């Protein structure tokens, strides 16, 4: 149930091409050879068999730069001894597991002891061990693979660490990995698609940037051997400190990440995906990057399946297919010509302007043809004459016939070329294609893909659909792939050849299609022939200028740019949507639908990401009349062409939210280090009488720059009255707005858009579709913003959370779910130069702008965000959201924490890649207690400041802060208004006498306590006093608190309204406990009396804890500690009773309710076993009063141990702290130990008492080791 590991760090030589260099464990005769090949310095992790770090275990070449692979399971432990032997210090942050702050790998605004901080930097020599828990919650879920992809690395400096090569491998399986893993089968190869950059490595001081796969560029990776007809598990771990992505294809295979078909393996910064694939073939294959930007010429490696010796249940394939139907697959009848025509990218043009964006790309002139171009399509014909065309249609131009096929069906694709050049026809995603009739190849044609059909040929292709290229019962009915030519991929693509492919399952029949294409006419074979025909001048010349190219990169929707495609669908009607992104593009498209919500991986989303050369299938229900545009979400597009609209048209209570849009002045980091800037936000208000912006506190203080929670269940209503302040006009769009069917006549473009200082109300019924699925969580996240300029005013500051809770779950008057502390995170980049309010930001007197880039979570930077505080064993529901441009592909990570997400199934994650626009919900429950960090794991974001700390605390650490005994010293107490000789220091609870509390005649009085340190606070015990007969006290009061000097804010916890009114005492002697679930974090705290009785008098005590939650009852009183762990030197044993050492529990009662030594003397003692190693901050002692004989211990020393024979007494100042104890039977006495001690066995020795030695106890402590 434990495993042992050893490891260090070493600097060496590495080249990215030739192997055999990663074996410097025995010196070789290779030093003369200092010739191109190219070499740098790189540093990595190195394994060692033993504990003296000299026996260097060898490694295989397929790993490459990967640190030694590490394994564990549930109910386990992991003991790893790191030792830096290189130059720079290294750490060891981990993901997926469980550690105790003594093992993190990063130091931040943690307010923690430095003993728990040396793990944050391991420096050369030395050692420093770590240990990880892999506890209950970290285990894998059901529909999860047998094992899960996680990792580790040094976190001392992210930008330099990952680019110097500090990285490793760390899978974690469940109880079920001990089995003899079939050594000639499973194999389980580990891959790293890392982007490396020596230009900001550790050691470097215009350097080269590199796309490697485990460290190998240009098809240089050996060692990849998997068996024949048996699958293999891909443990992919994307890196790259730069953002960017890698749409990764395997030459002739698909993938089985999760439960859906995947041609591409779309990775992004720090992804953690586990694919599976079947190796049905023999021979050698390639795995390359299919990005249009061929800087990625390195992301290519070699794969060879081979034969083996002699299918055990290891998630044996699950795409089961057989017979639940009736009819047979039909051989299909298709005739396709690749002939030539001319194309208008906007047959509905207009406006011959100049300043227009639609002039460069479209307006025909004497030197820019803009509008019409000569291309080459895939035309559909009815027979073999190829001289009668199948009815071509609008709303699917420039493209070829729809090509449909079930599993096992047959497609007879007959191809005739009627063009000036040889073109091909070839499908994607399908793994089975050969000529009809024959099996074998032409002449020297190693693979049919890139074989040209001559201008006149007639070739008979036979496509057949297997299963290992289709659905899984999980994904939608018909995944989407493409077909076109292959003899010149990029150019044939830009020439005009394109066509659709569909693979369905049985158990306008299939509707219309959409291709998002960047048609690069500038590489068409009909470039030098498009001039000689269309342009009025020949010797144009001088085209090397970068706006002749941007005069015809026709950013098109199908074959139509600038609102030229106008398809039509009625109301209520249901439409599948097969979407694709093929073209130049280079990157991914964040497509969206104005006022429409669609279903993706059987989940509901607002925006859908589209990788290059990636088919994604969706479907949406049409129940929103009007006229709706499309879009791209990714910046300079749309402007440049990509539009097309839709013209839909026809053929218990309610929750009220008064919202406006004001403009504050924001500063992201007053901490650390300052200019203050001007943005525009939303704020919850009170009335249309817009005077009282409802104050956001406690439950809404993490929000900061975000708009307010607008909560709503399903089947109720959502009224959004929205008045607009500000200067420029903005709006309120949701994609959940559902205007009723109004104004027939013709389809009207939806108005929205309110001029400043004007009001518009929104009122729509929440439908079931906006709600979360039965399979989903309790409350799905939705986006909402302003639709006036969805890019600029989004960098200005208008965004918020629209939450749709499900069923009768958002209860009470509070309008929250209350069973869960729910938070919202917003990972994006802010660039003030696009803001509407940037001109006025010349805030100085009288040139690179790199400090206007704010990598800001919720608008904070470098731990500056406060308001993240969650209960211990509570379930928390996080909401991650990414927006902006395509740089925002954030890898969200909670320091050491693991979370769960639901998309049809419930999987498990530690880092989330937040693709922009998509809004997904996650949940988690935290175990370890303290303050942790929330980061975006992208290297160049942590140092740019994208980070904030979040505290989890103890819900059962209540210790008197010190008002009583005097732990709270006398100078800490202050107040204004004091009447006369009723001093604020007399406010100590249970203190009577002549004068005995603190009063004040004055009206607006208060009283201040300084805790000297940022302390956690868990409640206030409020009393009063008596002057002869009149009971005086506080009947009603409210709370103030601060943190540094004068950032004072009120207490509005547990919603209620404006702020929480506390109820005071009622009598003199009577005590009142005003707890608060939502606790306070402060050090200065003031109380304000609102309704006294005669005079504001007060006798009090504060209930609190330290910032790391160490003052916990371990289990003495609550009987969580077993008696077999509680003994002594003896025990008063006889017949009247027995005072067993197991009877000395604080507050434990009985006729024999204590421990008593059989002989009284200053030698006796009592001992406690913990069976593990724990931390202790104090003891609490308590005597007993049997009969009329009071029995307690007046003084006691304390000694500690790790074993059971050797003891080290508790010292202080110079000698041993004689802890003074009880003076009565009842009242317990705390003695907070200082310093705290890490221990396993604890002893207590008396030195003096009363009558006879007797005691009950409870130990303030906390978990550790």
């Amino acid at each position, epitope marked *: 149930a434990i495993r042992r590991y050893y490891l260090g760090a070493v600097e060496l030589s590495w080249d990215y091409r030739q192997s055999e260099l990663l074996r410097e464990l025995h010196v070789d005769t290779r030093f003369p050879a200092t010739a191109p090949s190219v070499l740098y310095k790189k540093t990595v992790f190195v394994e060692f068999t033993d504990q003296l770090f000299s026996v260097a275990r060898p490694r295989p070449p397929w790993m490459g730069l990967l640190g030694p692979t590490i394994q564990a399971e549930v109910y386990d432990t992991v003991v790893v001894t790191l030792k830096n032997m290189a130059s720079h210090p290294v750490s060891l942050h981990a993901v997926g597991v469980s550690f105790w702050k003594s093992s993190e790998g990063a130091e931040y605004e943690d307010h923690t002891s430095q003993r728990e901080k040396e793990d944050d930097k391991v420096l050369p020599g030395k050692s420093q061990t770590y240990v990880w828990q892999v506890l209950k919650e970290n285990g894998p879920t059901a529909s999860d693979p047998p094992c899960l992809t996680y990792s580790y690395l040094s976190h001392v400096d992210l930008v330099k660490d990952l680019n110097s090569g500090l990285i490793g491998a760390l899978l974690v399986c469940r109880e079920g990995s001990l089995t003899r893993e079939r050594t000639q089968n499973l194999h389980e190869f580990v891959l790293l698609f890392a982007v490396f950059d020596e230009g900001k490595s550790w050691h470097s001081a215009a350097q080269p940037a590199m796309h490697t796969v485990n460290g190998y560029v240009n098809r240089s990776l050996p060692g990849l051997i998997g068996c024949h007809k048996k699958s293999v598990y891909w443990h992919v771990i994307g890196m790259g400190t730069s953002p960017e992505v890698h749409s990764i294809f395997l030459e002739g295979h698909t993938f089985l990440v999760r439960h859906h078909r995947q041609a591409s393996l779309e990775i992004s910064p720090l992804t953690f995906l586990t694919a599976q694939t079947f190796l049905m073939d023999l021979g050698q294959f390639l795995l390359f990057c299919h990005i249009s930007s061929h800087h990625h010429g390195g992301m290519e490696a070699h794969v060879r399946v081979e034969s083996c010796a002699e299918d055990g249940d290891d998630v044996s394939p699950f795409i089961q297919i057989r017979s639940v139907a009736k009819k047979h697959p039909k051989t299909w009848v298709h005739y396709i010509a690749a002939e030539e025509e001319d194309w208008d990218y906007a047959p509905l043009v207009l406006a011959p302007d100049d300043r227009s964006y639609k002039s460069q790309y479209l307006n025909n002139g004497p030197q820019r043809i803009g509008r019409k171009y000569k291309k080459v399509r895939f035309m559909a014909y009815t027979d073999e004459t190829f001289k009668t065309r199948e009815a071509i249609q609008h709303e699917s131009g420039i493209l070829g016939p729809l090509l449909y096929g079930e599993v096992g069906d047959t497609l007879l694709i007959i191809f005739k070329n009627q063009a000036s050049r040889p073109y091909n026809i070839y499908p994607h995603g399908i793994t089975d294609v050969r000529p009809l009739y024959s099996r074998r190849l032409p002449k020297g044609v190693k693979h049919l893909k890139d074989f040209p059909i001559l201008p006149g040929e007639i070739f008979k292709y036979k496509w057949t659909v297997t299963v290992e290229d289709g659905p899984t019962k999980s994904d939608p009915r018909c995944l989407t792939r493409y077909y076109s030519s292959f003899v010149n991929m990029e150019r044939d693509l830009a020439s005009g050849l394109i066509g659709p492919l569909l693979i369905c399952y049985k158990e306008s029949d299939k509707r219309n299609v959409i291709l998002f294409s960047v048609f690069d006419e500038n590489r068409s074979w009909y470039l030098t022939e498009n001039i000689q025909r269309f342009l009025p001048n020949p010797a144009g010349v001088q085209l090397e200028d970068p706006e002749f190219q941007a005069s015809n990169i026709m950013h098109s929707i199908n074959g139509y740019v600038f609102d030229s495609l106008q398809l039509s669908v009625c109301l209520h009607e249901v439409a599948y949507w097969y979407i694709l992104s093929i073209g130049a593009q280079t990157d991914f498209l964040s497509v969206f639908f104005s006022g429409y919500t669609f279903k993706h991986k059987m989940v509901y989303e607002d925006t859908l990401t589209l990788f290059p050369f990636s088919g994604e299938t969706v479907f949406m229900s049409m129940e929103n009349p009007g006229l709706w545009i499309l879009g791209c979400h990714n910046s300079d597009f749309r402007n440049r062409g990509m539009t097309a609209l839709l013209k839909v048209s026809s053929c218990k209570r309610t929750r009220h939210y008064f919202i406006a849009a004001v403009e504050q002045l924001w500063d992201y980091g007053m901490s650390e280090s300052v200019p203050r800037f001007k943005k525009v936000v939303f704020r919850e208000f009170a009335d249309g009488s817009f*005077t009282q912006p409802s104050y956001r506190g406690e439950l809404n203080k993490h929000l900061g720059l975000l708009g307010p929670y607008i909560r709503a269940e399903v089947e109720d209503n959502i009224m959004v009255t929205f008045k607009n302040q500000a200067s420029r006009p903005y709006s309120f769009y949701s994609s959940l707005i559902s205007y009723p069917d109004d104004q027939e006549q013709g389809a009207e473009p939806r108005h929205n858009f309110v001029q400043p200082n004007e009001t518009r109300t929104y009122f729509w019924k929440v439908q079931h579709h906006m709600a979360p699925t039965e399979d989903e969580f309790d409350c799905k996240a939705w986006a909402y913003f302003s639709d006036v300029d969805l890019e600029k005013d989004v960098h200005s500051g208008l965004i918020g959370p629209l939450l749709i809770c499900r069923a009768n779950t958002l209860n009470a008057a509070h309008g929250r779910q209350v069973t869960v502390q729910e938070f919202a995170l917003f990972f994006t980049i802010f660039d003030e130069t696009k803001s509407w309010y940037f001109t006025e930001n010349v805030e100085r007197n009288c040139t690179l702008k790199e400090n206007y880039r704010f990598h800001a979570i919720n608008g904070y930077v470098m731990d500056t965000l406060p308001g993240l505080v969650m209960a211990q064993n509570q379930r928390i529901r996080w909401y991650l959201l990414s927006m902006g441009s395509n740089e925002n592909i954030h890898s969200i990570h909670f320091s050491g924490h693991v979370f769960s997400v639901r998309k049809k199934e419930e999987y498990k994650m530690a880092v989330y890649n937040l693709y922009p626009g998509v809004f997904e919900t996650v949940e988690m429950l935290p175990s370890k207690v303290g303050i942790w960090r929330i980061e975006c794991l992208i290297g160049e974001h942590l140092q740019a400041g994208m980070s904030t700390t979040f505290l989890v605390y103890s819900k059962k650490c209540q210790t008197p802060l010190g008002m009583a005994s005097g732990h709270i010293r006398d100078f800490q107490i202050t107040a204004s208004g004091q009447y006369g000789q009723w001093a604020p220091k007399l406010a100590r609870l249970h203190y009577s006498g002549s004068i005995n509390a603190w009063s004040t005649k004055e*009206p*607006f009085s208060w009283i201040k306590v300084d805790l000297l340190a940022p302390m956690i606070i868990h409640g206030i015990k409020t009393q009063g006093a008596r002057q002869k007969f009149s009971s005086l006290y506080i009947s009603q009061f409210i709370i103030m608190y601060s943190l540094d000097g*004068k950032k*004072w804010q009120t207490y509005r916890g547990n919603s209620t309204g404006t702020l929480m009114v506390f109820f005071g005492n009622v009598d003199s002697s009577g005590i009142k406990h005003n707890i608060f679930n939502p606790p306070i974090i402060a050090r200065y705290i*003031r109380l*304000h009396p*609102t*309704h006294y009785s005669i005079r504001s008098t007060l006798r009090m005590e504060l209930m609190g804890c330290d910032l790391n939650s160490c003052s916990m009852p371990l289990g003495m009183e609550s009987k969580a500690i077993s008696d077999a762990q509680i003994t002594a030197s003896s025990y008063f044993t006889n017949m009247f009773a027995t005072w067993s050492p197991s009877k000395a529990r604080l507050h434990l009662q009985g006729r024999s309710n204590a421990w008593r030594p059989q002989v009284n003397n200053p030698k006796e003692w009592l001992q406690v076993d913990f069976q593990k190693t724990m931390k202790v901050t104090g003891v609490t002692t308590q005597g007993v009063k049997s009969l009329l004989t009071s029995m307690y211990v007046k003084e006691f020393l304390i000694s500690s141990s790790q074993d059971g024979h050797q003891w080290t007494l508790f010292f202080q100042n110079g000698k041993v702290k004689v802890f003074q104890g009880n003076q009565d039977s009842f009242t317990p006495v705390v003695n907070s130990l200082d310093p705290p001690l890490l221990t396993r066995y604890l002893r207590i020795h008396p030195q003096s008492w009363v009558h006879q030695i007797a005691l009950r106890m409870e130990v303030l402590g906390c978990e550790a080791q």
Partner: antibody
Amino acid sequence: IQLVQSGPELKKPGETVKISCKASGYTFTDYSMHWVKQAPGKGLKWMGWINTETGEPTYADDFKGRFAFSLETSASSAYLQINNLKNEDTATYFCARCGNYVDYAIDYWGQGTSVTVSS
Amino acid sequence: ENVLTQSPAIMSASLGEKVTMSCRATSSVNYMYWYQQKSDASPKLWIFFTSSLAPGVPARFSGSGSGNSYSLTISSVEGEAAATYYCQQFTSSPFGSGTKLEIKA
């Protein structure tokens, strides 16, 4: 603990006039401060306030373009430097406090000042 | 814009008669305050936080409420406490005080 203001002045339609408001016997810098307008008729009309921790005042709506609120940390006092004194500025101007924290109200007052519109 | 209306204007009281005066306001508030001007004097704090009384007021006074209509009740009025009364609020900006209110015994 009192607010000792200055005695009233006398000006002509549209000039410059500076008052005062010396403190009591406490830490003046911590506390806030308002000025009040009280015409020979209406109950009250608010003028504004100033967070006198380091000096960052505000204004009301009725009154704009022809007033001022300054500071003197030395003698613990606030000022009201009214420019472009129109004729109907004829009312009693006061001094407030609100306390040091939650919901700013009023604590003490003082003597007045008003010599408008004077011929 | 935060308007407070004082109700009534000036009433004819009686030396020992349960008399109350409201102060309803368009914009609704949480906490209310009152002040007495003793015939154009430097005004005085009388009720603070909705209902409780300040130090230095004959206990014959009270009054309370919440939201859109507050009140100021007096049990036994006496010619001593016969002056002018304004209500003033603090929930926004500006803090427009009430109109007018007076006592005649």
